[PDB]
């Protein structure tokens, strides 16, 4: 909470006068002094409170942490190595890592539980088609 | 304009608080793995003894 | 004032929009967090045309991104300037169409359209005064070509007096990527001609060819393609957002270009466009700009415009120039090329001037031409369509999802009638 | 959000799946124990909630030897302990045994496993199935699974990677019979079939890899590379993606014709891979080269219907389109008349990965084609000839008759193959 | 200030009491000697003023062996020495022994102990009683104790956890007689009864724990886990707490129908526990899986009356109620028409524990459900058939006659079971 949102009605009632009587700006100067006023109002709120090429990500595993596991079955001799076990004896080395990795992230769409239908009641109001000065 | 921009300044702080709440939810998520790893290693060695 | 709302669907359309929004944000000096860092006051006078103001003070595009597969929008969000789009406006499916017009127009899209039409209704009503709608899509794909055109019909049924602009990518028979392209192309164009107020054709083949020839760039890509088409799109409505000597909006272009209600298919071009090594060699003047815009090699369509006669043409200039010079340039170009200009309508060139140039360039021009030369794309597409259709190839799906060959025959007949009527005026004499 | 379920049945299926899952884990960085040391593995894996990952595969067999080898080998920890289903008695090359006697008591548990696995996934794309056709249990269980699944799930896509016996080299002597029977069974139930005869791949291995000592390890590694290249679009970002639903969009003119044949490029050893620049045009010409076709069939003997090729690497759309232009220019390769354009090409950024201790050299650009052409009638003709040579005198028939199969059942298969041949010959004619 | 008094009678009661009292002391961190290492316990234990705690349990038996084993075991220092009441002779599976001859001289001491225990407690909710129905002493003493308490205390609630004979697995031959007699006695006296036959638990242990040669210890551990899951709501904080008096106010449509059957999930060993999510939806589906009942009855053969389930762990009401909606959507589970809603849910934060040397692995989410369903008539039917086959020729009746029990008594129990079966059949029809 902040103090500014504590200001209340009945306090806007008569409360001094912002400018001293002796320092009135004159006509021509005010008439030439519109632009800074306008840009102040319009993007005061933008500067204060409002404030290529594909890239590859790194591969998940680092080589020094491969820690390949031994087989549960304890083979005694090289003679009895079977023809099904060649898959995966050799740990990858510096040569076999892919240099670049381009994954797909789905975290944005792993959300939005369901599409929305406005289960509401108009409230559109009319703006008129030509020179809104006659629309109610 | 000063008071209105103070209001949006408050709204930004509200975002910051809710983001920290999301990070707290992630810290909560850590708990399951933190239990699981050691818990199941010991529970698997239990039958081995 | 007189603002328009953007809608894009299909991955081709999403890639188009991602570059279009980046280009317009760069033009107005909007950072990808929505905060202003431009220099000129004129940069922000008409920002409400495309942007809506949010609390805190950022600007958000009034764009409706729609798709039947979420990977495309997940990709575009991670891209640069992806944060601008409001999360609410995204609408997506979980199945996709698989390049099947029947699936994307009858089965899945019919159920999914409710939310997207609701958000279109809300966003369109929210703005002050509607000027029109604009859509970008590719005709070679099932989901795009079907759902986009069905949504066009639905929006037309609800806003009959508004204008609708479409940027359609057509499947050229030269660079062909899918075997079922002619089918959904014809099926889409049948519905498009009846509803869309303006349709402007873009060909991947022609874009690639101009990239190879006038850019002379070694390895062109979809990024450069989207950049070219984005500059072309922005040039159309630049004079809408900025004051100029001859302000001209989309409704004025529509009234000026189409002699008859069903002839609203245009081909466009952009200039100046030079190789990077010769950019300082060339001499940017009005005569060079006009000879470049009227060069047949600069058109972004495969059609050869010299094989037919121009019905109407129009040019939009960016930068400050003397209007008279442009005037006699158009006059002399029309005078010597009376053979290529249809005669029963005198002075068939429109020109508009806007005093703001593109960032980094001193003059620019965008060309639109309604000519009878486009009939060749339609003829070749219909030829491929009938070649595939005589042997009843691939028809079993479209039969299996509530659709049948009767409306295929009707679509072929309608397309042939359109071609014949478009050609009838080519030989017309006074 | 996209998921696909893999089925391996038969000894050939298991020995191919082991190699393919080796390559998948190597590609996604998952260590053999299943524990890693944004979400791309979701195509083939499932997160356990905390730690390791579970493959989305099922292994089936009736002889326990290979299943036990899997459950004891280095990849033991990876699979769920209760998804490697093993029977007790082998069908022993008898399709009748594997389709009427023993498989009926294992198919139930298989379907419970399949249902429980499909329940976890939310965006199920389809099924892959692997089975050697020249085996009793393979053919029978595969046929039964396809017939059951096609009615349980309906419109879901299924892709069968069948290894048809070579024209003249085969292991057994009874494989034509069960090949014909299983072909009849799958013709009305599989949406896509891929030809994978062994002899052509053996030819490729002896010629290009320069290996005079080839075994099934190299065969399975090649098939795994083909699978990975085919599925890269589901789990890797690219300038032009394709879904498994976007295959029968371009490869299936009519529901009866759904058998296609594959090819891969480039194939070269590391000792001479670095003596060439390996252009995209060169590799795509090697792709359409008839002798590099993965199936022992001659494309020069018939028309093409349609081809779809996947490129992975740093290829350029102009490179692809320029190559396709030259291919269309070529006179020797002729397409069917009613297909003006028949090419479907896709692009993916991820270069192919190399397996340590393998034979294939690491190359930055690769292309994998699936083609549907009229030439496929020749293998069916020779299979029918071999089937007739044996059935002319009722050889081996009593072994199938004594396992519950009726006498006449061969007649319907023979007639269906005749109808298939006539359908190809009549769709191959010009109008 | 919430207490409940626990009664153990019979060998089955003692053998489950040992297991459950090990579990409770593991829950509350109390060493077997009774000391606490340096308020939730107040439900089950009472403070001695300085040091240890005394469980609120009483053990009754006419068999000195198990009592002596308890008094010589590791828990010798926990229980009060003068609440382990032991007799001199066993009933020898004869109901008349434990109901008319030998239990009358011990029931007075039992009631004196009960009075002394109840005087200390101030906010007692009721009694939990454990007994075996197939034992003479268990049945007779349970019947006599319930008859005495029902007039001594009045409206206090009593819960009987009875282990009924299996359809065909059994250890005795005369047990239908004592079973029918005990049903006659406690039908009028027990507010809530739980069916816990052994064969279903055997099947659970075989299928899930993958234990091929288990014993009664595993059964008793499972029963203790169920009891703790039931009673955690009284001694731990929960988002939706349920009391003992909050069970009968939902689970008993009519005064006669008060037998329920339970299920518990998950039941998974650590060898494969960490291979799956253990998600709320899958555990609540496992709860209603017909094979996971600890009672050998088929829920599919009858309508449901009322289901009350307690979740413990990090469960979320969103998840729970979303699962309940799916269950209601499911077709193969049907409820009686006059019960539009039948679910009583409870949520607690305390996760279940693991006991050292056990088989189960603890998990972050557990569910225990109690169901009253119309299918329970089948067990009464089969027990009635077993009774009739033996009583047709007056087999074994003379040893019940010769111990003071009059002959005609069996007819009354038979006609009351007939009345109960008729009541179930009547209430099972739709309106
Ligand atoms: N490509 C390839 N084919 C194989 C491999 N192993 C077996 N086959 C083929 O499988 C056919 C016979 O079936 P098998 O795989 O040996 O065994 P099965 O399919 O389980 O049938 P059964 O032998 O009855 O158990 C042979 O003709 C081989 O061509 C392999 O490792 N690679
Ligand atoms: N679940 C389980 N049931 C048991 C156990 N011990 C005995 N029972 C059951 O008890 C029934 C018979 O009663 P018992 O407990 O053996 O003996 P009893 O109830 O004290 O009656 P008596 O034999 O006269 O002493 C058998 O049918 C068993 O099913 C046990 O440790 N676990
Ligand atoms: N300009 C441009 N066109 C593209 C891009 N990506 C794809 N295309 C075009 O889109 C066509 C394929 O569209 P398709 O995938 O079927 O659209 P869908 O139906 O929405 O899936 C191809 O012919 C390409 O020419 C891109 O990044 N830029
Ligand atoms: Mg085999
Ligand atoms: Mg006993």
TrEMBL record, chain A:
Signal peptide (residue range)? none
Where is this chain's protein located in or outside the cell?
Answer: Cell projection, Cilium; Cytoplasm, Cytoskeleton
Task: Tell me which GO cellular component terms the UniProt record holds.
Answer: axonemal microtubule
According to its UniProt record, where is this protein mainly located? Answer: other
Q: Give yes or no: UniProt keyword Cytoplasm.
A: yes
Keyword annotations for this protein, in alphabetical order, are: Cell projection, Cytoplasm, Cytoskeleton
Which InterPro entries does this UniProt record tie to the protein? PIRC1/2
Which biological processes are named by the entry's GO terms?
axoneme assembly
Quick check: keyword Transcription in the entry?
no
Please name one Pfam family that this protein belongs to.
PIRC1_2
- Family affiliation: Belongs to the PIERCE1 family.
What is the protein named?
A: Uncharacterized protein
Q: Which organism is it from?
A: Tetrahymena thermophila (strain SB210)
UniProtKB/TrEMBL annotation, chain B:
Portion held of the full protein = 101 to 149 of 447
The listed locations are: Cytoplasm, Cytoskeleton, Flagellum axoneme; Nucleus
User: What is this protein for, i.e. what is its function?
Assistant: Microtubule inner protein (MIP) part of the dynein-decorated doublet microtubules (DMTs) in cilia axoneme, which is required for motile cilia beating. May play a role in the control of meiotic division and germ cell differentiation through regulation of pairing and recombination during meiosis. Required for sperm flagella assembly. May play a role in the assembly and function of the outer dynein arm-docking complex (ODA-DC). ODA-DC mediates outer dynein arms (ODA) binding onto the axonemal doublet microtubules.
Which organism is this protein's natural source? Tetrahymena thermophila (strain SB210)
Q: Which residues cross the membrane?
A: none
Q: What is this protein called?
A: Meiosis-specific nuclear structural protein 1
Please state which protein family the record places this protein in.
Belongs to the MNS1 family.
């Amino acid at each position: 909470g902040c103090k500014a949102m504590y200001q209340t009605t009945n306090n806007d009632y008569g409360q001094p006068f912002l400018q001293d009587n002796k320092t009135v700006p004159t006509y021509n100067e005010l008439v030439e002094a519109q632009t800074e006023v306008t840009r102040a109002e319009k993007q005061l709120k933008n500067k204060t409170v409002a404030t290529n090429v594909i890239v590859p990500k790194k591969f998940p595993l680092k080589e020094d942490s491969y820690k390949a596991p031994e087989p549960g079955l304890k083979i005694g001799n090289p003679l009895y190595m079977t023809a099904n076990r060649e898959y995966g004896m050799l740990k990858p080395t510096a040569f076999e890592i892919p240099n670049r990795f381009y994954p797909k992230d789905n975290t944005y769409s792993k959300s939005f539980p369901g599409m929305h239908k406005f289960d509401g009641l108009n409230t559109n109001i009319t703006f008129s088609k030509v020179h809104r000065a006659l629309d109610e | 304009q000063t008071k209105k921009v103070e209001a949006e300044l408050e709204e930004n702080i509200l975002r910051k608080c809710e983001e920290e709440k999301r990070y707290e939810a992630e810290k909560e998520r850590i708990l399951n793995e933190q239990r699981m790893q050691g818990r199941f290693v010991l529970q698997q060695q239990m039958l081995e003894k | 004032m007189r603002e328009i709302v953007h809608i894009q669907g299909g991955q081709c359309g999403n890639q188009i929009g991602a570059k279009f929004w980046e280009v317009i944000s760069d033009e107005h000096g909007i950072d990808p967090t929505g905060t202003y860092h431009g220099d000129s006051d004129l940069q922000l006078e008409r920002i409400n045309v495309y942007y809506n103001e949010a609390t805190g003070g950022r600007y958000v595009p009034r764009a409706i991104l729609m798709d039947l597969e979420p990977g495309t929008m997940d990709s575009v969000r991670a891209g640069p300037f992806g944060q601008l789009f409001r999360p609410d406006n995204f609408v997506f499916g979980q199945t996709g169409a698989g390049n099947n017009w029947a699936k994307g127009h009858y089965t899945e899209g019919a159920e999914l359209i409710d939310s997207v039409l609701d958000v279109v209704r809300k966003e369109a009503e929210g703005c002050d005064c509607l000027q029109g709608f604009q859509i970008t899509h590719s005709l070679g794909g099932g989901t795009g070509s079907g759902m986009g055109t069905l949504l066009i019909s639905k929006v037309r049924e609800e806003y009959p007096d508004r204008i609708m602009e479409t940027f359609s990518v057509v499947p050229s028979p030269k660079v062909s990527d899918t075997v079922v392209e002619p089918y959904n192309a014809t099926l889409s164009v049948h519905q498009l001609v009846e509803n869309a107020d303006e349709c402007m054709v873009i060909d991947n083949e022609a874009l690639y060819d101009i990239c190879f020839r006038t850019l002379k760039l070694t390895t062109p890509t979809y990024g450069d393609l989207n950049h070219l088409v984005s500059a072309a799109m922005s040039g159309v409505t630049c004079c809408l957002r900025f004051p100029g000597q001859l302000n001209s909006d989309l409704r004025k272009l529509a009234v000026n270009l189409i002699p008859f209600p069903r002839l609203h298919f245009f081909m466009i071009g952009f200039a100046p466009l030079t190789s990077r090594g010769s950019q300082q060699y060339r001499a940017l003047t009005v005569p060079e700009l006009t000879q470049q815009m009227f060069d047949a090699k600069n058109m972004m369509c495969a059609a050869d415009p010299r094989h037919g006669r121009y019905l109407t043409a129009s040019a939009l200039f960016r930068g400050r120039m003397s209007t008279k010079e442009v005037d006699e340039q158009m006059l002399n170009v029309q005078n010597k090329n009376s053979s290529y200009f249809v005669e029963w309508i005198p002075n068939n060139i429109k020109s508009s001037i806007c005093d703001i140039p593109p960032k980094g360039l001193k003059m620019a021009v965008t060309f639109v031409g309604n000519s009878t030369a486009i009939q060749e794309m339609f003829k070749r597409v219909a030829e491929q369509f009938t070649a595939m259709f005589r042997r009843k190839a691939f028809l079993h799906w479209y039969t299996g999802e509530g659709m049948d060959e009767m409306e295929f025959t009707e679509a072929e007949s309608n397309m042939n009638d359109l071609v014949s009527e478009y050609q009838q005026y080519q030989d017309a004499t006074a | 959000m996209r998921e696909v379920i893999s089925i391996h049945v038969g000894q050939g299926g298991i020995q191919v799946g082991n190699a393919c899952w080796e390559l998948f884990c190597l590609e996604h960085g998952i260590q053999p124990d299943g524990q890693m040391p944004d979400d791309a593995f979701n195509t083939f894996f499932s997160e356990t909630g905390a730690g390791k990952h579970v493959p989305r595969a099922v292994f089936l067999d009736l002889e326990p030897t290979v299943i036990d080898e899997v459950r004891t080998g280095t990849y033991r920890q990876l699979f769920h302990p209760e998804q490697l289903i093993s029977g007790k008695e082998d069908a022993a090359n008898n399709f009748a045994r594997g389709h009427y006697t023993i498989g009926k008591e294992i198919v139930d548990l298989c379907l419970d496993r399949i249902r429980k696995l499909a329940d976890n996934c939310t965006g199920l794309q389809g099924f892959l199935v692997f089975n050697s056709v020249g085996g009793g249990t393979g053919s029978g269980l595969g046929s039964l699974l396809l017939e059951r699944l096609s009615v349980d799930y309906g419109k879901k896509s299924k892709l069968g990677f069948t290894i048809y016996p070579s024209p003249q080299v085969s292991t057994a002597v009874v494989e034509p019979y069960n090949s014909i029977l299983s072909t009849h069974s799958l013709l009305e139930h599989t949406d896509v079939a891929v030809m994978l005869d062994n002899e052509a791949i053996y030819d490729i291995c002896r010629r290009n890899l320069d290996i005079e000592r080839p075994t099934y390890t190299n065969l399975n590694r090649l098939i795994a590379q083909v699978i990975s290249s085919l599925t890269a679009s589901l789990r890797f970002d690219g300038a032009l993606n394709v879904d498994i639903t976007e295959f029968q969009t371009n490869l299936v003119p009519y529901p009866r014709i759904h058998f296609m044949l594959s090819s891969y490029a480039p194939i070269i050893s590391a000792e001479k891979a670095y003596h060439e620049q390996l252009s995209v045009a060169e590799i795509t010409n090697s792709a359409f080269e008839p002798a590099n076709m993965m199936a022992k069939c001659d494309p020069r003997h018939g028309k093409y219907m349609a081809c779809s090729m996947m490129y992975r690497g740093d290829v350029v759309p102009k490179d692809v389109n320029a190559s396709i232009a030259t291919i269309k220019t070529k006179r020797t390769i002729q397409f069917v008349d009613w297909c003006p354009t028949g090419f479907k090409v896709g692009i993916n950024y991820q270069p192919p990965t190399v397996v340590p201790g393998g034979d294939l050299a690491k190359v930055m650009r690769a292309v994998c084609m699936i083609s549907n052409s009229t030439a496929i009638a020749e293998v069916f003709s020779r299979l029918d000839h071999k089937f007739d040579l044996m059935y002319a005198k009722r050889a081996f028939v009593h072994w199938y008759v004594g396992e519950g199969m009726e006498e006449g059942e061969f007649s319907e298969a023979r007639e269906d193959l005749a109808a298939l041949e006539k359908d190809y010959e009549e769709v191959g004619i010009e109008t």
